[PDB]
């Protein structure tokens, strides 16, 4: 199903009209609050003293309806950025008036047009209105894909449409929104209602709207082609955009009169529903990540904190991770023990950080698949989980598993290990301190011993998301640095964003590590070719890992293990959004830092401009040892 409404600039009987559109199958209505042609004078007499009423009464609908069904529209004559002072001053007063009436009715949204370059004064007034009174109203900026000037039929004899292309010129519509939203200091209550023309522009200018808080898409009736049997439809490239927009879950807005008069009006709507019906159905991954889209989370710290029961339970339901782990041990067995040794040689396996013990069961399944014998140690620091392990142990596993209720860095092993099996990986691989944990544990691995995983690698990519930048911005808390939220990573199912370059590797760790002076601190410089005008809001983190040989796990979008929802991506925000021009290189610098107590990250952007070094000394974010 689609959430969509009818746009009208003419309403005779509000009672009939709202019924008529609801009958047609529309969820809401976009209408004016005052008559569009009813220009009002606020300054000079006699026009100033026009007797009321100034508009129709609020009594005509129930509060229920005003709150749910009606989206107000600023009278088209209101022009706060006029060249004429008198119009400027009147528009100011008029705008405040109309916005106040909108808020008085308690409308969920109110439409305002971005149809020219200069909207400085329009912004100020709205901003002033936003900081006056206490209301929860949203504001939709009507901004078109292509400027009306760049759509005109080339029919002016002495002013032809310049046939040459301009990369930046054709993106001018985004720059209108950008200037406007920046002036309003990224208010969460200012969104985009994107108008779609008949002719879609080049793919690049469509793409800049990625990461933008698009709440609505506006479709003029005219843009709809008619088919073999007199029905409104859309092109293939228009369908593409619609499908892109459906994933972003925007509301749709139909504007203009029916130009396919022979059939009913709900025909435009029917086709939209039909397009929503036909959408490629959600995969195994998307049926799990449903509610988590663009939702910021704190990173887990399973060292200094014990994980809750349900946390384990949910992540234990992964259809792939344990299947991949089972195979990675299965291959390591067949390699370490020859066929003639299948009864003389019992291998010693050590599950470091066993959790509730699914990797113990996966170790047991790997044995009775490779027909080899194994001794098991289930080491776990979380005493609450150890309760589950010792219960699994007594009821099922028996003497084969030797549960150890301690930290691996601390545990004194009775015997050395053939294979150590561990899943201590975060979204950025090393961020849950898997390097440090296995280091204090590799002393009780045999000299020829195998560590699973063998290695892992973190990846980074620059993102543009004005949406996610505002989410972080909203994470300011009392009793701490007012910018602390920018100096910490977030686990998030990234959704409304734009990947500006290809993910490149960042940090890599190998296990075991026989380097004489073992060191886990890092410093890495990355360079990202960017080929669009954009605004950088941070860096997206992913990881890959090698469990054994070719058996691998990845959350990197290119090599993502299919159906594996165990990890969402990480986000490293940056304090100030950086403007990036087409054909420029983003240069980022990451440092992994640690002392004896805690490990943390520090980052900075060096090109095209410099940012501040983020989270220095781990002042805002650390992972404790």
């Amino acid at each position: 199903r689609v959430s969509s409404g009818r746009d009208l600039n003419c309403v005779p009987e509000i009672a009939d009209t709202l019924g008529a559109v609801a009958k047609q199958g529309f969820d809401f209505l976009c209408m004016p609050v005052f008559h569009p042609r009813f220009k009002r004078e606020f300054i000079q007499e006699p026009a100033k003293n026009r007797p009321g009423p100034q508009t129709r009464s609020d009594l005509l609908l129930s509060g229920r309806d005003w709150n749910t069904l009606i989206v107000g529209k600023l009278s088209p004559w209101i022009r706060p950025d006029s060249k004429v002072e008198k119009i400027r001053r009147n528009s100011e007063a008029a705008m405040l008036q109309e916005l106040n009436f909108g808020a008085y009715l308690g409308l969920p949204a109110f439409l305002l047009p971005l149809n020219q370059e200069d909207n400085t004064n329009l912004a100020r007034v709205l901003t002033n209105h936003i900081h006056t009174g206490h209301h929860s109203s949203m504001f939709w900026m009507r901004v078109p894909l292509v400027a009306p000037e760049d759509l005109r039929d080339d029919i002016i004899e002495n002013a032809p449409t310049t046939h040459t292309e301009e990369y930046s010129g054709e993106e001018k519509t985004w720059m209108w929104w950008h200037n406007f939203r920046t002036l309003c200091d990224y208010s969460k209550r200012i969104a985009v209602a994107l108008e779609i023309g008949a002719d879609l522009p080049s793919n690049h200018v469509i793409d800049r709207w990625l990461g933008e808080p698009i709440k609505a898409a506006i479709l003029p009736t005219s843009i709809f082609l008619t088919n073999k049997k007199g029905f409104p439809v859309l092109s293939k490239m228009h369908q593409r955009l619609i499908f892109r927009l459906l994933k972003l879950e925007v509301q749709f807005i139909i504007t203009g009169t029916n130009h396919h008069s022979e059939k009913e009006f709900c025909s435009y709507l029917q086709y939209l529903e039909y397009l929503s019906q036909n959408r490629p159905p959600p995969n195994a991954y998307e049926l799990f990540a449903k509610g988590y889209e663009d939702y910021l989370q704190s990173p887990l710290q399973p060292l200094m904190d014990n994980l809750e029961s349900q946390t384990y339970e949910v992540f234990e339901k992964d259809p792939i991770k344990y299947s991949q782990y089972q195979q990675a041990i299965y291959k390591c067995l067949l390699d370490r023990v020859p066929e003639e040794e299948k009864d003389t040689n019992v291998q010693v396996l050590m599950v470091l950080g066993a959790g509730r013990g699914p990797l113990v069961n996966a170790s047991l399944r790997a044995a009775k698949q490779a027909d080899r014998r194994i001794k098991l140690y289930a080491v776990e620091k979380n005493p609450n989980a150890v309760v589950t392990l010792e219960n699994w142990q007594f009821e099922e596993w028996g003497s084969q598993v030797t549960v150890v209720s301690s930290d691996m860095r601390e545990w004194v092993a009775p015997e050395k290990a053939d294979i150590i099996v561990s899943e201590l990986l975060g979204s950025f691989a090393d961020n849950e301190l898997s390097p440090e944990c296995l280091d204090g544990a590799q002393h009780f691995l045999k000299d020829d011993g195998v560590s699973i995983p063998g290695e892992y690698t973190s990846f980074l990519a620059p993102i543009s998301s004005s949406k996610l930048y505002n989410e972080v911005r909203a994470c300011r808390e009392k009793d701490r640095d007012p910018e602390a939220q920018f100096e910490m990573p977030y686990v998030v199912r990234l959704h409304n964003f734009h990947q500006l370059s290809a993910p490149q590797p960042c940090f890599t760790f190998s296990h075991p590590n026989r380097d004489p002076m073992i060191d886990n601190n890092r410093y890495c410089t990355l360079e990202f070719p960017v080929e669009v005008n954009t605004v950088l809001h941070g860096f997206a983190g992913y990881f890959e890992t090698v469990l054994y040989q070719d058996i691998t796990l990845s959350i990197r979008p290119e090599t993502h293990s299919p159906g594996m929802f165990s990890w969402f991506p990480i986000l490293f925000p940056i304090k100030q959004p950086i403007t990036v021009r087409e054909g420029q290189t983003i240069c980022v610098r990451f440092w992994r830092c640690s002392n004896s107590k805690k490990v943390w990250y520090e980052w900075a952007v060096t090109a095209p401009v410099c940012s501040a070094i983020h989270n220095p000394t781990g002042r805002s974010y650390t992972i404790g040892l």
Partner: protein, 309 residues
């Protein structure tokens, strides 16, 4: 009269004298429960705007943005609904009946004019489009998306059936000629100017016209010379309408949002001025019978008759 409504909406939008003497009125409701429009016929010009002393009347679905006389019985209407509709008069002239009603514009149809022949008309709208209509056949022959903003005013040339002016908030004034492959031509008095709002051809010379900007400055233009011959700060507000008198050497009537009326020389000097209106001045119409008589409507529901020296 039968079908003629008992009451008329407060906001009077247009006033046009028929060549025989009658007065046509279009009025909209721009406030209150119902936002609508009505059409009125007054064979007694002095009786206006009394709903009880009218010859004919009818309600329209939505408000009246603009209208024009088509011939002697036809009424052409630019509806808020996005529709252009023709209203046919009775043979008795006591009933106003709808001829056609076509929803072809997407936003409010804001301006309409009839071409010299009287079988074709041109409409401008907020949707930015301008459309050429076949009145006899009730269809659009041509659709022109030439401007970049809402079309404020369209005025057909007096005699050439293929020529008309149009101005819009994109600061463009376009001289049209459907005979050319590129019909529109950008006629600019100056490169930067306050937005044009009103247009009127000179009734004698098909080569000169006048235009009022949003600033209260009426300017006289020559098409061939393409320079502002003359201008004057006539109004203190947006110039909303311009009408020439039927005189041999004609006067210019001037409408604005400063609620005042102005009647001007050929050199645009002030002759007459009237603040008789307490709200916006919406239209002006010269009496065919008495040339020195001029009728003006406003949003103050006042129908005023002026005697011009």
């Amino acid at each position: 009269p039968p079908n003629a409504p008992a009451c008329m909406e407060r906001q009077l939008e247009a006033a046009r004298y028929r060549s025989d003497g009658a007065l046509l009125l279009g009025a909209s409701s721009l406030s209150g429960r119902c936002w609508a429009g009505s059409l009125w016929l007054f064979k007694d010009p002095c009786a206006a705007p009394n709903e009880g002393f009218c010859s004919a009347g009818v309600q329209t679905e939505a408000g009246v943005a603009d209208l024009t006389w088509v011939g002697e019985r036809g009424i052409l209407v630019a509806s808020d609904s996005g529709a252009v509709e023709l209203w046919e008069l009775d043979e008795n002239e006591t009933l106003i009946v709808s001829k056609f009603c076509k929803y072809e514009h997407d936003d409010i149809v804001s301006t309409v004019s009839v071409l010299s022949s009287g079988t074709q008309a041109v409409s401008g709208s907020k949707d930015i489009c301008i459309k050429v209509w076949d009145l006899a056949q009730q269809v659009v022959l041509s659709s022109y998306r030439a401007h970049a903003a809402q079309v404020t005013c369209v005025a057909a040339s007096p005699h050439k059936d293929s020529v008309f002016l149009s101005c819009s908030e994109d600061n463009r004034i376009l001289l049209w000629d459907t005979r050319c492959p590129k019909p529109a031509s950008q006629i600019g008095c100056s490169a930067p100017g306050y937005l044009p709002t009103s247009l009127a051809w000179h009734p004698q010379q098909s080569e000169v016209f006048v235009f009022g900007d949003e600033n209260g400055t009426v300017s006289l233009v020559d098409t061939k010379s393409t320079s502002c011959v003359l201008s004057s700060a006539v109004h203190s507000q947006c110039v909303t309408g311009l009408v020439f008198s039927p005189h041999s050497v004609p006067f210019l009537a001037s409408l604005s949002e400063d609620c005042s009326l102005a009647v001007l020389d050929s050199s645009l000097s002030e002759l007459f001025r009237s603040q008789a209106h307490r709200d916006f001045v919406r239209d002006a119409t010269w009496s065919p019978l008495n040339h020195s008589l001029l009728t003006t409507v406003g949003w103050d529901h006042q129908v005023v008759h002026h005697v011009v020296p």
